[PDB]
Write a protein that binds this ligand. Structure first.
Ligand SMILES: *c1ncc([N+](=O)[O-])s1
Ligand SMILES: *c1ncc([N+](=O)[O-])s1
Ligand SMILES: *c1ncc([N+](=O)[O-])s1
Ligand SMILES: *c1ncc([N+](=O)[O-])s1
Ligand SMILES: *c1ncc([N+](=O)[O-])s1
Ligand SMILES: *c1ncc([N+](=O)[O-])s1
Lengths: 306, 306
């Protein structure tokens, strides 16, 4: 009973966080095996970010310019190389706490856990989604650059996000762990901005199914809809189009509840056209879109990790 | 920038979770030093919960009746004793991962992180508040009995909650780590029920200050109020009374924003009397009450733990 925005347990990632300092810049890095990954912005100092040439900045740097601290232990840097927008700092010490891991890039609409960190020290953990416009609505202060996002499956940590910056609306932009930005953003200070977003339709439907599993039925109705007639109405309220593949992945939740996917779409259509009339769903007065179909199944089943 | 419901990093608690099995009952336990703490309900089996005498049930039990598993390692039980509604299982092995810890009981209105677990394996982490009626609005399935709630300060883990049961409205009841229930609940199957709740007024005000720190100002107004005139209006919408001590602890947030506490109360009064008129605050269409004044300061400052 109950349904909560739930993050993955963070212990496996906590044991990988370190502090990187170069010049007058300090940020967070990620220590796996004998490599420390961090944002390349660390080689910039208070004159080197309007239009930096990082290749030119990096070849001027000596290994000893890089202070890496793992707790109160100093790690010695023995090599460095730049891969897109991340640095790879080769250290003389392999992290004995390295979990099984993968570097994966996620799709907009997919969710993950963020471990927010300052000076290599973990501050909090929370769940995020990749918006359709490739930003994320996080919580990040000065110093949090280099904090990572991730998913866990059995014993494997799939790292998907490294934090780099704040956009002028208060949302956040970052890279995958190969250093490639999500969306049309750069690791400079330009006038770049988020650009328009949409609501993640398949996730809203997953959350409506969660509400039914949990005992809410008030929003159901007698009607059905075709997939075309739904998307027509859905485009009108700034919702992403729904595909047959989306219908297919909502199949398990449909079979568990006995509500055909297209009947749930009829519910959503009425909720979009009429509002909630002072009611709530799962403690929310807004249609929530940061739970995937898989999150709902995972939470409602009790799946664990080792 | 941004403001999120953030849980504490969970690694220190993950390394304390184990599985306890007795008869046909399996649940979660908490291994600190050479003691495993778990709900005493584990000595019940499918006939021993309508009106159990646990003292009488426990003296019939042999140490070898208790299977404790820490990962794929079996811990041998060498003693047992009952303390209120928890068991203390003395094992022959001290947990090398025992953090610095305290057992503390929290007040209604205070927040904490829950690490939901099944079979000794962590599933997810999320933030909760102790409601005024001593329940918590969690997310818990069959098998989650024995999961704990906690806070962290620097390097100290203050354990405050052990989960025991679900109430018929879908909310949850449990004990502190000395085995004393929060609120008027028992670890039997009776007809017990939650009883009426209220909204945590001081926390709503803290969250309004968070919104101002974050850039929302739309809900502010020109008016002020006395503390009496506010509580009059506040009682009317099922909100807890606000005290001078509450006013005092909101002082830091008032000084950071330049908005006197009683001017913020005037804002809340108007929001209670008029609604939001289709607007939102920090991505919510409801007045949120699960952030304490201290949570806001902690998040907006970047405080970390080691
Ligand atoms: C997923 N949401 C609610 C469940 N329940 O069984 O109470 S499972
Ligand atoms: C998760 N399982 C195995 C991995 N590997 O790199 O082998 S990651
Ligand atoms: C990490 N902190 C700041 C960055 N920037 O590109 O400005 S990256
Ligand atoms: C706490 N909430 C928002 C902050 N900010 O500085 O953007 S601090
Ligand atoms: C947090 N700091 C010290 C503790 N102790 O039991 O000594 S708990
Ligand atoms: C832990 N699981 C069930 C309990 N009960 O008192 O029924 S305690």
């Amino acid at each position: 009973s109950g349904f909560r925005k739930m993050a993955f347990p963070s212990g496996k990632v906590e044991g990988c966080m370190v502090q990187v300092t170069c010049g007058t810049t300090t940020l967070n890095g990620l220590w796996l095996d004998d490599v420390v990954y961090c944002p390349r912005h660390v080689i910039c100092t208070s004159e080197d970010m309007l239009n930096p040439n990082y290749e030119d900045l990096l070849i001027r740097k000596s290994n000893h310019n890089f202070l890496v601290q793992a707790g109160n232990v100093q790690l010695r840097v023995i090599g460095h190389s730049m891969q897109n927008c991340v640095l790879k700092l080769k250290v003389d010490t392999a992290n004995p706490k390295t979990p099984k891991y993968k570097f994966v890039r996620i799709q907009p609409g997919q969710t993950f856990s963020v471990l927010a960190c300052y000076n290599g020290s973990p501050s909090g953990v929370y769940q995020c989604a990749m918006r359709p416009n490739f930003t994320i609505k996080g919580s990040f202060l000065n110093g949090s650059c280099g904090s990572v996002g991730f998913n866990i499956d059995y014993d494997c940590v799939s790292f998907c996000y490294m934090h780099h910056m704040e956009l002028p609306t208060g949302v956040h932009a970052g890279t995958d762990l190969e250093g490639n930005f999500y969306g049309p953003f750069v690791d400079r200070q330009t006038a770049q901005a988020a650009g328009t977003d949409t609501t993640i339709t398949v996730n809203v439907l997953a959350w409506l199914y969660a509400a039914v599993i949990n005992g809410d039925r008030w929003f159901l109705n007698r009607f059905t809809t075709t997939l075309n007639d739904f998307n027509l109405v859905a485009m009108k309220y700034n919702y992403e189009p729904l595909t047959q593949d989306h219908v297919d992945i909502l199949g398990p939740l449909s079979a568990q509840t006995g509500i055909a996917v297209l009947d749930m779409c009829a519910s959503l259509k009425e909720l979009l056209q009429n509002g909630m009339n002072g009611r709530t769903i799962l403690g929310s007065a807004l249609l929530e879109d940061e739970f995937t179909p898989f999150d709902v199944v995972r939470q409602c089943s009790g799946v664990t990790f080792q």
